[PDB]
Design a protein around this ligand. Structure first.
Ligand SMILES: *[C@@H]1O[C@H](CO[C@@H]2O[C@@H](C)[C@@H](O)[C@@H](O)[C@@H]2O)[C@@H](O[C@@H]2O[C@H](CO)[C@@H](O)[C@H](O)[C@H]2NC(C)=O)[C@H](O[C@H]2O[C@@H](C)[C@@H](O)[C@@H](O)[C@@H]2O)[C@H]1NC(C)=O
Ligand SMILES: *[C@@H]1O[C@H](CO)[C@@H](O[C@@H]2O[C@H](CO)[C@@H](O)[C@H](O)[C@H]2NC(C)=O)[C@H](O[C@H]2O[C@@H](C)[C@@H](O)[C@@H](O)[C@@H]2O)[C@H]1NC(C)=O
Ligand SMILES: *[C@@H]1O[C@H](CO)[C@@H](O[C@@H]2O[C@H](CO)[C@@H](O)[C@H](O)[C@H]2NC(C)=O)[C@H](O[C@H]2O[C@@H](C)[C@@H](O)[C@@H](O)[C@@H]2O)[C@H]1NC(C)=O
Ligand SMILES: CC(=O)N[C@@H]1[C@@H](O)[C@H](O)[C@@H](CO)O[C@H]1O
Ligand SMILES: CC(=O)N[C@@H]1[C@@H](O)[C@H](O)[C@@H](CO)O[C@H]1O
Ligand SMILES: CC(=O)N[C@@H]1[C@@H](O)[C@H](O)[C@@H](CO)O[C@H]1O
Lengths: 175, 323, 323, 175, 323, 175
């Protein structure tokens, strides 16, 4: 994609995440598990639905063909009528197909932007209290249970609360 | 020791649905929405509750003029649309043509109901023979003629000038039909109408018409080389129509009150009634769908999706899917 | 202790202007630009310096033929466009029809100025009476007739054959008008024209016409059962037009030189002159704007915005604005 | 947004900033204050203005309807004429609304991209001479008068010129 | 001391090609693909292997009726398309008109080859003179006439009634032409045709036509004030056509079998043949290109790019190019 | 650009790089040189080439004008015919110009994206074994020959394999 998140710096999708589009996998002493970011997926399901409806609403006024008949000496206006009717069908066929191709592209990049934007939402919370592995994961420089994890999933993660604890762990590695 | 970690990722599943994009085709995605209806039931149905007028092997001219082979339609109820075949078998039984036929058919597409009324009783022609018939218009093994017009001929050996007027005293506008006969030679002319040189005048507040027979030799169509030429007018409520004639007059017998105007169409289909119901009908089958597009036929009537020439039209709603 | 700090950010304000996007409606934005003109003055104006030809209750046919109730328009100056009502009251005072009226009207939409000339002095009919008049054509409570054609009838008890010719010696093309009278019975025919069997021939380098009256019974329109049928041609410069007739002839008296062609149209409007000025006119009011779009009426004339059916069209220039 | 800047990792705009679209807020001993980045706002006013002119100009030649009249036995051609003229008004109405909906979307994403590119213009200058707070602000690690701020606003900021004061302060936090 | 370095960067070159975008015009780019063909060879060529029919100063009417100046086209080979000038000099040599001409010209756009057949040998007029000739149709300094129709006049002092019939026994449809002559006065009528009151009836399974001369005064066109009006019909395989007349008949001599149907058009061009070959032809030159668009002319025939009004149409393939 | 790579945080293009669109310039003891990114230039050539074809075929069915003739009393259907054909021509010209203008925009920003994602492909590999100079360049914290240079080009760069060599060098600077 255009942002490097989906099928980029974070490879592959999570079969086991069935609750949403974007989210978190955690691994501490209380085992593993998946959890969806409700805020970033509700914004995304509402964004895509509005677009889909916005595509349908733009085609409410569109050309409708009607049958007209002509005698054997009205071949010129019969031809004028056929070209005119095929002409608009081609125009609206082009307009729909192009609208589908164009928004499909921007929907996929919407999902790409949303995942990378979620990554940087967590990356700016941990700072140096965790290390960027470069595959979408952060290895903490301290202990993080299942309410600390919850604090970063809802963005309440208070930094200095683990600042000193982590610093000591960094000094052990740089020795 | 590697410690506790939190990772960011996205949904994936077993979906196989593909989607097209400007730069890349067949991109597999987690969730997609189809917006193109591609299926129909292959039958002609009612539109909302209203049945179409299904002409069988009868054409609009056969119906309106009263081809004896179309008596099924002597008095049709309100219809939702008209169905006619491409090459109807029972059209003009006597050879000839229908003047401004296509403008008439177009008027018909704005009409949902006719009521036939009789405006000249066959027993009101006391100085003419009102019994013209032809082997080209058989009814029940015998020669007949159109039912809504009458073929007048000479009685004894005379054809007095017909001066007849009809006043549309109804509230509704009237579709009135009539004709003129073009014979093959002066002998046949004198046998049927006596007078060698004849005319027909038709007068209305707007119509000011004069017809004259074209007596001449022409190809046999269905064994006849004579021709019948038909005409029509809409007699407005309270206006009167005037006929003056000394031969070759195919006089109006029945006329049509325009009872209800509205949306209708004349569909060309070979299909037959289906005893079903729909809100969207095409000549090749009806549509019941909530998708905003379809590609089955450009000519539809009713509450319909928008026609497009596409074979496939799929929207991406979800995200790109991992192998 | 906290030290020196720098932050990077963006503008916000008290703006309430909203903007639509594909995925989101009603997005408040700091700066927006409306590009859809939605207002007009509700008047009929000059187009540049030029006044329209405003027919009041007169139709185009009423004007050109010279309906006595349209004397306001005997000699109109150059116009920018023409305004006509939906159902003008002063049309053909005498009942009948104007042949090829719509093609005449379309020619008229490509013309900015006529100059009316006399092509036959009315005192040149020395063997016919040229004072034909009708109660369907009142002028001052009295019977009159169209001013641009003349109703010829028999003088003494004769209608000598008219053989009259006119050569367009002018440099501009000539619009020439004439008619034929259709009486209701043989007695009136002889009363007006003596000759029972009559014709009208008209000849040009391209026109080759022969008319024959249709004497017949018909409905009363404005107390009359007669009809007048009018015809028109464009006589090219240096070409000649030739008339022959032995009755029922409504002869040309005045014709129109086509002095200037250009863009104009015939607008249908109930509005009256407005004593204003514009660069852009619609049937329901004039437009003074620099907007690139407008939604007032699809039929405009002059330098105008582009018509769209949109109720609203706002462009986003600024940024998303914070609550 | 697609970039996470406007109403993203920095929410809300600066009401007190009246000179441009994007810029800086600074706070040292020499009081506080705003300063607009005119360079990044000039590229954007030129960018948006050109777009507006390019859409208006692409529709200068477009379908205009003309009145045509038909008599009572020409209802077929009259209907053909009516369907054709409505037909083109609908096509050009669709073209105008859709062009607005699409470029409005891209006008907004143009702006956070300009904010994000500007954020990364200073972030890539200070590096470890400053700490990223993660909300659009940097409390840098040294002393800056009102000409130090000027060097980063025009991008002439020499890194080692203040690396040591910061280095000691990094060592001071490392104490 | 400073160590090892790796840098990530992009291509640049000395290219000068500019490209347009929504927010900025003339952005210089490294690689572009032009997709707009703007050049033609400026001549009339063959389409595939097949030569066009280039009428020189002849119109389609002049060709089919057989204007003596169009003997070059008396029997033309199969054509791919037809080239005709805007105002061809050799048209209807005798003044008059061609009835429903534009509908005939339209029919012509699906015909690639005629094969002319004789339907009445000129030596079958034993009771009429078949030698009508006119100074309006000169051939080699002398008065001639159309080669495919025959001007019949009285023989001795009689014009017996003509009754001639033809049954199209061919597999292909037939184009049949005939005409009527309108004299200037009753004296000329009896001088040429003896009978003062004359007619022409033409009959087919579908045609039922009756013409009558319009004897009247008209301006001289090419020194003549008479007129000839021509008519045409398509006689289907197995149908018959019937002609009856007692004067003023311009009789069919030759008719055309429609032997090959296919795609064609009538192009209006002043150009002449070019002895080249093309797959795509326009009225002002041929197109040899691989471009998907072109801008030379809207009327093309064959395998062509799509016409657009653009002066420039360039795609960006590479990236923005550095100063 | 919309992503800040081309004509942004990395100024200018490389006249001397002739093998592809995007790539690397290296400077070790074994001299300097340019080298193309093989994987990323084909994905981009596949991207632009396919788009070019999808633009050509989305206009294959388009309005074709035909010659029609009318006599002097058919001015109304002659005019209707002229408006109908001029009308479809204006529609298809707009569709062509606007499709080109809109995809040109999206082609240039695609390039901008491909360069930035390539930057992040090596930045997340080297981490603290290199210093981001902030101009698109990385100065190593160790010695890097011409099998080290290729190792970062294939995403085979082993981080812990020489982290210590690098860690001491930072502390050598950190003294
Ligand atoms: C046009 O001519 C056809 C062919 O003529 C017949 O065959 C010839 C080889 C020769 O023997 C002629 O003298 C023959 O009549 C003719 O069609 C034939 O008509 C006969 C009636 O006599 C049929 O029995 C025969 O089947 C038929 N042949 C074919 C191949 O159709 C047409 O005459 C009649 O044709 C029939 C089909 C009807 O259309 C009828 O109206 C018509 O009189 C003849 N066309 C016309 C308009 O006269
Ligand atoms: C058609 O028949 C109706 C019914 O009689 C006629 O209308 C009536 O005419 C009488 C005058 O004799 C009038 O007093 C009535 O008020 C009127 N009734 C209605 C419902 O209109 C009509 O005749 C006449 O109609 C009037 C309106 C007028 O147009 C006149 O020209 C006409 O003769 C009959 N129509 C015709 C054409 O005779
Ligand atoms: C209409 O009147 C004009 C004015 O007299 C005629 O044109 C003149 O014709 C004479 C010959 O009779 C010629 O010497 C003059 O040069 C010419 N004047 C002009 C300005 O062209 C015209 O008569 C004749 O015009 C010529 C050109 C030709 O078409 C001939 O057939 C025609 O009779 C008059 N037109 C008609 C139709 O009578
Ligand atoms: C360009 C391309 O490969 N399109 C493919 C087509 O070949 C294939 O037949 C179809 C389903 O099988 O899916 C799509
Ligand atoms: C979907 C939606 O929000 N629609 C609203 C509409 O109800 C309201 O009339 C208009 C002006 O306030 O703004 C918009
Ligand atoms: C806005 C602008 O400068 N457009 C330029 C034009 O001036 C120049 O004539 C043309 C050819 O070089 O290229 C483009």
């Amino acid at each position: 994609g255009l942002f490097g998140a989906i099928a980029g710096f974070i490879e592959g999708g999570w079969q086991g995440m069935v609750d949403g589009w974007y989210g978190y996998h955690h691994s501490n002493e209380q085992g593993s598990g998946y959890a969806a970011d409700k805020e970033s997926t509700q914004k995304a399901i509402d964004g895509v639905t509005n677009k889909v409806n916005s595509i349908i609403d733009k085609m409410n006024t569109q050309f409708e063909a009607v049958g007209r008949e002509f005698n054997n000496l009205e071949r010129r206006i019969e031809n004028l009528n056929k070209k005119m009717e095929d002409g608009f069908l081609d125009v609206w066929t082009y307009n729909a197909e192009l609208l589908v191709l164009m928004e499909n592209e921007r929907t996929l990049d919407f999902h790409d932007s949303n995942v990378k934007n979620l990554y940087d939402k967590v990356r700016l919370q941990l700072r140096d209290n965790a290390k960027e592995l470069g595959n979408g994961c952060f290895e903490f420089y301290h202990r993080c249970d299942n309410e600390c994890m919850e604090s970063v999933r809802n963005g309440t993660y208070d930094y200095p609360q683990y600042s000193e604890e982590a610093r000591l762990k960094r000094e052990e590695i740089s020795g | 020791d590697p410690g506790d970690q939190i990772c960011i990722g996205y949904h994936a599943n077993n979906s196989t649905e593909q989607v097209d994009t400007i730069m890349e085709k067949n991109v597999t995605v987690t969730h997609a929405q189809d917006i193109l209806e591609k299926t129909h039931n292959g039958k002609l149905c009612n539109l909302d509750g209203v049945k179409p007028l299904i002409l069988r092997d009868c054409s609009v001219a056969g119906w309106l003029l009263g081809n004896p082979m179309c008596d099924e339609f002597l008095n049709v109820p309100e219809w939702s649309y008209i169905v006619e075949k491409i090459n109807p078998a029972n059209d003009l039984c006597y050879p000839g043509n229908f003047n401004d036929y296509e403008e008439l058919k177009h008027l018909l597409s704005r009409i949902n109901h006719f009521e036939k009324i009789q405006i000249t009783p066959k027993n009101s022609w006391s100085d003419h023979e009102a019994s013209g018939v032809s082997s080209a218009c058989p009814y029940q093994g015998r020669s007949s003629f159109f039912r809504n017009v009458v073929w007048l001929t000479k009685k004894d050996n005379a054809y007095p000038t017909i001066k007849r007027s009809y006043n549309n005293t109804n509230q509704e506008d009237l579709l009135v039909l009539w004709g003129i006969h073009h014979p093959n030679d002066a002998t046949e002319q004198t046998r049927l109408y006596q007078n060698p040189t004849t005319y027909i005048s038709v007068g209305t507040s707007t119509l000011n018409q004069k017809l004259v027979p074209k007596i001449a030799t022409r190809s046999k169509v269905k064994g006849l080389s004579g021709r019948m030429e038909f005409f029509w007018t809409i007699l407005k409520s309270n206006d009167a129509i005037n006929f003056e004639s000394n031969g070759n007059f195919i006089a109006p017998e029945n006329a049509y009150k325009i009872v209800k105007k509205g949306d209708s169409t004349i569909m060309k289909s070979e299909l037959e009634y289906g005893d079903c119901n729909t809100k969207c009908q095409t000549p090749i089958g009806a549509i019941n769908s909530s998708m905003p597009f379809h590609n089955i036929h450009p000519l539809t009537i009713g509450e319909c999706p928008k026609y497009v020439k596409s074979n496939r039209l799929v929207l991406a709603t979800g995200l790109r899917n991992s192998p």
